[model samples]
Every structure is written in C-alpha cells, then in structure tokens.
Target: LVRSKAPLRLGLAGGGSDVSPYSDIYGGLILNATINLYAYCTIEETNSGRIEINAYDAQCCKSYLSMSQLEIDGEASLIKGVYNRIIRDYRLEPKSFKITTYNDAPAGSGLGTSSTMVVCILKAFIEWLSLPLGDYETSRLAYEIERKDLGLSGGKQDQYAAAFGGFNYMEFLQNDLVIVNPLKMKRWIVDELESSMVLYFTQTAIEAMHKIKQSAIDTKLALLKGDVGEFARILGEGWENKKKEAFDVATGAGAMAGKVSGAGFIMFVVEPTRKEEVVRALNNLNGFVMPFQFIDDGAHGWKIYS
Candidate 1:
C-alpha cells in the first residue's frame, strides 16, 4: 500500500509569469508557500487488469488499463496525463492498479489543488515503481508533461511548490532553469505572515486558461519596461482584478488583495490583520473562511498498513 500527500500552495507574488515560454524569456520571479492543506493519492495493485480511479470531489470512478484506451476529461486529465507520460517514458505495459484521490478543498478554488493532485499522483507512481528521481527533477518533468505534453495552460510554481515544499522564491532564468532560494526569515516573521493571512472561498470558480493568458501578456509588458516595482505591485493586485475578467471569477466578496491562485481557481488568500473582521467581510459576501497553515514539507509517500 502506498499513499502520498502534496501541499496546496498560495501565491505571494508572481503568479502568471512563471509558466514556461514566458518565464524562459523575460526571467520571472515567484514567491509562494505550501500550506497544511493537501491532496492525497492512494495506489494499490489489483488482480484484474483494470485501472480504477476514485476521485472524492468529482464523484466519479473510472477504470482503464491502457493509457491510449482511457477516457480523459475535466479534472481527471491531471491523473491520466501523469500515467500516460510515465508510460511513454518507461515503455511499460499498462497493468492493473487502483488509484484513489482526495483533497481538502473543492476543485477550481484557486489554491493550487490541481498541481498538488498531479504531484501526489506522480509521487505515488514513483514510489510504487521505485523511480529514482529527485524532487526538483520530478517536478520539472511533470511540469513539461502537463504543460507541453498535455497542452495545459499554467505556470511552473505550483508543481515546484508541491514537490519542493516550504517558502521559496523561485526565479525563472533565461536558460529555462528555475533557481530556487529558500527564504531565511526570522521564525517570528514567518508566523506573522501566516497569522496575517487567511483564505476565503468565493465559491466562484473560473477557467484558468483565459486568465493565465492575460497574465502572460501583462507580465511581458511589465518585464519589457523593467518595471520591477510595478510588476510586483500588479502581480499582487492583478489577482483581484482577475476576478472581474470572468463571470465565475468574482466570488462576490472584497479582499485586501487578490490574485489567481494557480492555473484558474480553487483558493484565494487575504491578508487582514483582524481575523473576525475578515470572517465577517467574507460572510457578508457569501464566502467561507478556510482553516489552513503553512507546511514546511513537500510531497512524500508512506506505507498505509505499516
């Protein structure tokens, strides 16, 4: 039995520009942290030559042995994409396996849930088959598979955050290499950031593809003009502005600051010093406050019955 957990991430700054092709050009920097909330994946071998998938939130179960024969759609694409990519790379025969996935939050909430899911699934497969890859290597490979191989529209921060974990400043260099630097702040400051931060669900989810495109354009313009200050300011402000870009993007609530969390939607974090006031503000807008904490660890696997 194998189970793995990957942390859900919150973008502190630089959300959209980190996606490849753009990050490769203008050299972008993203600040984000992993949270206690996680996506879990459990994989076990089955006698039948069937691939069984049970997604808790999607309320769907799909079974298929062959990658080419599997049905891919909606949220399930993340899992299927990993399976197909691994199979193609290893040239292995598709066999029977049962995959059960669960998450602490709902889909399209903007909390980087999808990337967490993908990282968790990849961790499960790597453990099950004993793949010898480091965290960074696995994350980069998965990012390529999802973005380039599968044509998903998103950035590299989520996958890297999910794999590497902790608070990091990820620099997208010109040579397509992500330079990760850990934030060595005082422990008190770290706690302060967490305490001042809170996540509220607008219950309004939007497709990430369109919002990401807009962000890419905005980031390019900002980088070309060497407006680092404006870039940072807008990166933080653009998330809230993004709420107006799509009808489903607006959660009907106001926040101190807003930005797209991951690819499209799932979770949004607000920095309001007064906790009660923050809760009240979200409640008035028909939003719910989520309890979460910063997680220092990234994705890891464990034995279920050990």
Candidate 2:
C-alpha cells in the first residue's frame, strides 16, 4: 500500500494575486500557511485486473479494466487528471490498483481543497512508482494537471502550499514562473499564532486584489517581527479591501482580525486570552470551529511492504 497526504492551507493574505492576467503581466504575491487539515490518498495494488477509485468525500466508487488511460469525466476528474498526466509523461505501463481518497475539509471551503487533493494523489503515485521528483517538480506538475490539462480556474498558491507546506510567501511571475519561499518562523511566534487563530467555515472581484497584494507584503513583515497586533490589523484591513473586490465574523468577543480563507469560508485572529469566548460566540452562529495547528511538512507519502 502506498499512502500519502497533503496539508490544506489558509490564504492568509493576498488571496487573488496569483491568477493569470495579473501574475502573467505584472506579478502576484501571496502569504499562506498550511494547517493540520489535509487531503489523503491510498493506492493498493490489486489482482482484480481493473483500476478502482473510491472518492469518499464525493460518495462515489468505480472500477475500470486496466487500460493505458482513464477518461476525464466530471466525477473523479482530479484523479483522472493525475493519472493521465503521470502516464503520459512517464510512459508507465498499465496496472491494477485501487486508489481511495478523502479530504478533511469539504470542497469549496476556500481552503485549497481541490488543488491539495491533486497534490496528495500525485504524491501517492510517486511513492508507488518510486518516481524521482522533488518538491518543486511535484507542485508544478500538479498545477499543470489542474490548470493546463483540466482547464480549471484558480491561482497557483494552493498546489505549491500543499507541496511545500509551512508558512510561505509565494511569488507568481510571468512565464508561469513561481517561487515558493518557506518562512522559518521562530518557535514562540508559531505557537502564539496558532493559539490566536481560529478556523471557521460557512462557506471576489479584481481592483481590491491590488490592496490584498499590498497587505500580503505588510503581513510578511508583521509575521517576521512577531507583531500580532500589526498582523491582526493587516488581516482585518485586508479583509475589508477584499470585500470591495469580492466579499465575515463578529466584531466583539475580542476578535482582533479576520478574513475569508478563499471566497466564503473564514478565519479569525482573536486575542489569545479570549479564544474560548470567540470560539463560543462563533459556535452560536452554528459554524464548525475547527481546531488545527500549523504543520511544517507538505505532501508526504510512504509504502508499506507486507
């Protein structure tokens, strides 16, 4: 069995700067951090002489006879995208296997769920086939599979965030060039940030994106300086700017700053002292308060010999 998992991320600041027309012409900058939430996949070799897919979240399972390629249908498109890309690029022989996948957060939660799952499945394939690929290669290939092959829409941050893991200040430049710089934050800062942050899910324009880009620049400084006050201020202000572009949380309960993770789901940076109160207040809203930690690693996979 080959098992793999890729962490989901919170688009802390500069959420939309990484798309085309923007990054393609000018550039894009974003700040994001990976959390314990993840997309998981397992590949088990089978003697059934057919390829099987079990997408737990989507509530679907199917099997097809071993073939050179899988069709890109609506359901399980991500899985098919990965499989098709891997086979075409590597020229691998067809084999019988069952690939099961799931995610911690629901799709469209704005936490980079779909892109992360792509990374997760690709990692499992890498493990199962003993493919020689590094972090950058894996992330870039995942992006190509989603954006190029599947013709999906979104920025480049999610796949890189899942592949690289940790807190990253990403740069999307012309010619589809991406630079993923991992932030080596101090221990105290990491713990404090985690303690003060809350992930809540409930589930857009363009001019406001300029403001978000600037906020991301400022956020990097506040984070490096360990200034939660400044960080929170930037987060809230960025959210305000984001509303002008696209468009929420309570004001009181000592919530310092909050913003949407992607398009609808939100997260807040609360006063560490009043975390419980904020969580309690949000719970009253009937939203799930997810408890999570900052994870240091990105997509990981391993094989179990039996």
Candidate 3:
C-alpha cells in the first residue's frame, strides 16, 4: 500500500495574481499557509486486472479495466488526469490497483482542496513506484498535470503551497517558473493565528489582483515581523481589493480581518476572546464553522509492502 497526504492551504492574499496571462505578463506574488485539513490518498496493488477508485469524500466510487489511459470523466476527473499523466510520462505498464481518496473538507469548499488533491494523489504514485521525484519535481509535475494535462484554470500558488506545506510567500514568474520561499514564523505567531482564525465555508481582474498582489507582500512582512495587528489589517485590505477583481459574494463580529480562502469559502481572523461569539453567530446562520490549525509539512508519501 502507498499512502500520501497534502495539507490544504488558506490563500491569505494575492488570490488571482498567479493565473497565467497575468503571471506570465507581470509575474505574481502570493502569501498562503497550510492548515490541519488535508487531501489524502492511498494506492493498493491488486490482481483483479481492473483499476478501482473510491472518492470517499465525494461518496462515489468506480472501477475500470486496467489500462494506461483511464477515461477522464466528471466524477473522478482529477484522479484520472493524474494517473494518465504519470503513466504517459513514465511509460509504466498497465497494472491493476485500487486508489482511494478523501479530503477533510468537502470539494469546492475552497481551501485549495482541488489542487492539493492533485498533489496528494501524485505523491502516492511516487511512493508506490519509488520514483525519484523530489520536492520541486513533484510540485512541478502536479502543476502540469492540473494546468496542462487537465486544461484547468487556476494559479500556481496552491500547488507549491501544498507541496511545501507551511507559511509560504511564493513568486509565480513567466515561463511557468515558480519560487517558493517558506516562512519561518515564530511559535507564538503560529499559535495565535490558530486561535484567531475561523474557517467558514460559505474575483476579478488585473487591477484588483494588482492590489491583492501588493497586499501579499505587505502581509508577508507583517507575518515576519510578528505583527498580528498589521497582518489582520493587510488581510482586510486584500479582501477589499479581492472584491474588485471580477466575481462577488458575501463578514462577522469580533473579526479583525477576514478573507475568502477560495470560491465560496470564507475565513476570519477574530479577536481571541470573542471567538465563540463569532462562531456562535456563524453557527446560528447554518454556517459550518471549521476549527483548524497550521501544519508544517507538505505533501509526502510512504509505503507498506511485503
């Protein structure tokens, strides 16, 4: 059996600046951090001459005859996308296996779940085959599989954030070049951030993204300086700019600063003492408030075989 896990990330700032045509033109900057939630995958070899996929989180499963290319259907498109790329690039012989996956958070709940799942699934395959893919190699492959192979639309931050696993200030430059600079945050800062944040599941254009990109830089400095007040201030500023981007949506009490983690997912940095008050208000609104903490590790895989 091969197992892997990749932590989901909160895109604290610079939401859409990483998308191509923009990043390719002027470059993109993003500030994000991983949380306790994760996308997990397990691959077990089998002799059934068929491939099985169980998306437990989606409450769906399917089986296919073993083949190098699996149909890229709607239910498990991401998984099939990754598998197809791995097999094509590596020229692996067809083998029967059962691939099971699930996430701590529901799909499309934001929090970078989709891209993180790609990283998680790829990591599992790496372990299973004992591939020599390292951090950068693994991350780059995940990115290509999503953007190139799957022809998806998105930025580059989530892939690197999920692969590096922690507080990161990433630069997405032209030619698909990315630089992930991991932040070494103080212990108190990390702890305080956890206590102050509430993940609640509930963009635009170049100009707004430009503002957000600048805010990402400011947020990074605020974090490195251990200035929670400044951090929250920057987060709020980023949210305002985010509203100008293109899309729109839906705030809370005792909240210092709040921002959208992705589409439909909102999170707040609340006053430590007033956390319950905010949580209570969200709960009353039928909001499923998720309690989370920061995690330090990125996507990784291990194996157990006899």
Candidate 4:
C-alpha cells in the first residue's frame, strides 16, 4: 500500500492570472501558502485484475477492467485523467490497483481541492513506481492532466501550490517553467496569522493585470509586519478593484478584508472578538466556516509494502 497527501492552499493575492494564453504570454505571479488541510490518496495493489477508483469525500466508487471502460466524468474524470497521463507519459504496463482519494476540507471550498487532489493521486503513483519526478514536474503534469486533458477551467497556481506547498512566491513563465520560492518566517508570525484568519465556504474568480503587482507587494508587507488588518485590506483591495464584480464590503462585519481564496471559496480576516459574529452569520446562511493554520511542507508519499 502506498499513501500520499497534498496540502490545500489559500491564494492571498494575484488570483487566476496563471491560466493559459495569459500566463503563457504575460507571465504570472501568485502569493499563496499551504494550510493543514490536505487532499489524500492511496494506492494498493490487489489480486483482483481490475482498476478501482473511490472518492471518499464525494462518496463515489467505480471499477473497470480497463481505462477504456470507464464511463467517467466529473470526479472520476480527474482521477481517470491523472491515471491515463501517468501511464502514457511514463509508458508503464497496466496493473491492478485500487485508488482511493479523499480530502480534509469540504468540496469546492475555493481552496484548490481538485487540483491538489490530482497532485495527491499522482504522488501516490510516483512513490509506487519509484519515479524520479520532481516537484515542478509533478505539478506541471497535474496541470496538464486537468486543464489540457480533462478540459477543466482554472489556472496553474493550484497544482504548483499543492505540489510545492508552504508559503510560496510562485512565478509562472510563458515557457511553462514554474519557480516556487519557499519562505521562512518567525513562529510568532505563523501564530498571529492563524489567529487572525477566518475562512468560510459561503461563496467565488478574480482576474486582472495592473493590480497584481500591487497585491503581491502588499501581501508580503503584511507578512513581514505581522499586520492582519493590512493583509486583509490589500486582499480586499484585490477584491474591490481587481475583479469585475461590484460590491461595497470590508470582510467580517465590514471591518476585515474579504478575498476569493481561490475558485470556489471565500474568506476574511478579523479580530478574534468578531469571529463569533461571523460564525453566526454563516450559520444563518447555511454556510460553513473554519479556522486553519499554515503548514510549511510539500507533498509526500510512502509505501508500507514494496
């Protein structure tokens, strides 16, 4: 049995400019950091001569004798795309294995769930085969599997964020080269961040160019100064001027900053005293809110039997 995990990330600024035709020409930058939440996957070889796929979060399962037989779309499509890409690129003989994928966070939380999931599944397979795939290669392949093959709509940040993990200043070049610059900070900074951040799955894309550089600078300054208020404010600036939407709101009781963490999620930062009110609001809306801490590690995979 081989098991692996890829941590989910929160995109603080410079959202959604990493997609093709955009990053491929203008280049892209994203300020993001991984959280404890992770997308998990496991692979176990079995006596049954069949391919099995299970999604613990979605509660979906299916099996087939060959990849060609998979009547798949949606959840299974990501898994299937990863499987096909791995086999074809590496030219490996097919084998019988049951792959189970799951996550620690809710589905579509705007936290890069699916992209991290693809990295998770691929990590398990990489360990199983003792493949020499590096962090960039692993993530790049995951991006191709999703955007190129599965026809998914998204940017390249999620895959690289999950694959590389930690607090990163990630740059995506037109040549398909990704540079992940991991950051090191004081323990108190990490502690302050965890206490200051409050994430909710209540909602949300944000795309723009001129404002991207400004957001990155502001995010870094907030990180350096340990100023949660400033962090949310700039993140909120991206929220206000960066996107096409129109809204007059400051995040968290109109004091904190609100930003699209990524894709299918939204969040804000507020004083601890104000969090209960935020939680209550979410409760009334039938939405879910949770707190998370930053983690400075990348993806990993290991085998119990080899």
Point to the candidate with the largest lDDT: 2
lDDT of each: 0.70, 0.86, 0.83, 0.77
Query: Which sections of candidate 1 miss by over 4 Å?
Result: 66-75, 203-273
lDDT tens readout by residue for model 3, 1-306: 999999998887777788888899878999889988999999999999999999886566988999989877676888898889888888999989999999987777777788899999999999988878887888889888888888887778888888999899889888878888888888998988778888776634676768878888988888787777888888777667655432122274437777776556677887788878888877766456888889989999988876
lDDT string for model 1 (226-299, tens) is 44444445555565555465424344454444444533433433454555666676656544667788888889
Q: Which ten residues in a row have the lowest lDDT in candidate 1?
A: 203-212
lDDT of 2 by residue, 116-211 (tens): 999999999999998888899999999899998999988899999999999999999888898988999899999999888888765035566677
| lDDT tens digits, residue span 177-253, model 4 | 87888878688988887777667665022235646745776787788778877887786666667455322222434
Task: Report how far residue 181 has shifted in candidate 1, in Å.
Answer: 1.5
TM-score for every candidate vs. truth?
A: 0.76, 0.94, 0.92, 0.87
Residue 217 lDDT, candidate 3, scale 0-100 = 90
Q: Sort the predicted structures by TM-score, highest score first.
A: 2, 3, 4, 1
Decide which is better by TM-score, 2 or 4: 2
Q: Pick the candidate with the highest TM-score.
A: 2
Worst 10 residues of 3 by lDDT: 245-254
